[PDB]
Amino acid sequence: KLERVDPTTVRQEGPWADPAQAVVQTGPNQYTVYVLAFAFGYQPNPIEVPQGAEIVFKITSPDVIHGFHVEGTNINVEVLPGEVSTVRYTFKRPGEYRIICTPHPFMFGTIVVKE
Numbered sequence: 100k101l102e103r104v105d106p107t108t109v110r111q112e113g114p115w116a117d118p119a120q121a122v123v124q125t126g127p128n129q130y131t132v133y134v135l136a137f138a139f140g141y142q143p144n145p146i147e148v149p150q151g152a153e154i155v156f157k158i159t160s161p162d163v164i165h166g167f168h169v170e171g172t173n174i175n176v177e178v179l180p181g182e183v184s185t186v187r188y189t190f191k192r193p194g195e196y197r198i199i200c201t202p203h204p205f206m207f208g209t210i211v212v213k214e
């Protein structure tokens with residue numbers, strides 16, 4: 100069901116290698132966001148997306164299992180090394196959202212949804 104990726108090369112080549120290129124416009128009101136869930140943080144940080152846009156999160160791990168839950172939303176997904184977790188969401192409220200990892204409570208990320 101989930102797309103496969105080589106976890107040993109995910110940080111050197113491909114769409115998760117450069118966090119400055121994590122946000123790719125794939126349509127007029129559509130963005131794909133390549134998120135790396137690693138020990139112990141998120142890449143990019145912060146994730147910046149416009150409000151009302153369809154976001155396609157493509158999340159993967161180069162090490163161990165991580166969680167990807169965006170507080171105040173129903174986004175609650177497991178992130179496995181070598182597998183791509185896909186989350187589709189449209190943020191209707193601008194502001195800052197916290198990304199939470201259940202196994203690592205010291206691991207935090209930020210999403211900024213712009214007006």
Ligand SMILES: [Cu+2]
Nearest residue numbers: 165200203206
């Ligand atoms: Cu974690």
